[PDB]
Amino acid sequence: MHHHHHHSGSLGDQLTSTLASALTKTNTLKAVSASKPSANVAVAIVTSGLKKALGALRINAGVSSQLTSAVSQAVANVRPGSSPAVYAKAIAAPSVQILVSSGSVNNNNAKQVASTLSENLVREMANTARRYRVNVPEASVQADVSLVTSMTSTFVISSQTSVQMGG
Known part of the structure; x- marks a missing residue:
């Protein structure tokens, strides 16, 4: 639609591939996914992490508002009983499309925002999950933040046409 x-x-595309890939191996996603809660609580959990992630990145409230509305829709469409792969994608797809449309993410900060957003999103997501019979030990959450961050730390956009006028 926007890609x-x-x-x-x-x-x-790359942001979602990495963001979803990392979240696919994160207890914060495997725990909630395997728990098979419901699109009702899942939406509230994702929103919590989205607000913190966007708030920590000084993201405009306007874009941060629509991003949550969309992300929640995709997550509320996957329905319960679905692997953490679909959930993570339903949160990154609508996130990258809006993040790129708002310029919140470009070919230079995408790695930074992806690490911070996921770092805060995964942390908050777990906190809320606990209230939904999906408690997670800080020992596991910490690993998810370091894992998602490490992935971005070495994220290189394979774009040939990436000339910012410098020569």
Whole structure:
């Protein structure tokens, strides 16, 4: 819908691939996914992490408001009983599309925002999950934050046309 066609790999495409991939191996997602709670609580959990993530990145309230509305829709569509792969994707897809449309993420900070957003999102997501019979030990959450962050730390956008006028 917002993604590009084909040339240098859309920025959102890579962000979602990594963001979803990391969240797919995060207890914060495997615990809630395996718990098979419900789209009702799942939406509230994701929103909690989205608010903190965007708030920590000084993201405009306007864009941060629509991002939550969309992310919640996708997450509320996957329905309960679905692997953490679909949930993470339903939160990154609508996140990258809006993050890129608002300029909140570009070909230079995407790695930073992806690490911080996921770091705060995963942390908050777990906190809320606890109230939904999905408690998570700080020992596990910490690993999820370091894992998602490490992935971005070495995130390189394979885009040929990435000239910012410098030569």
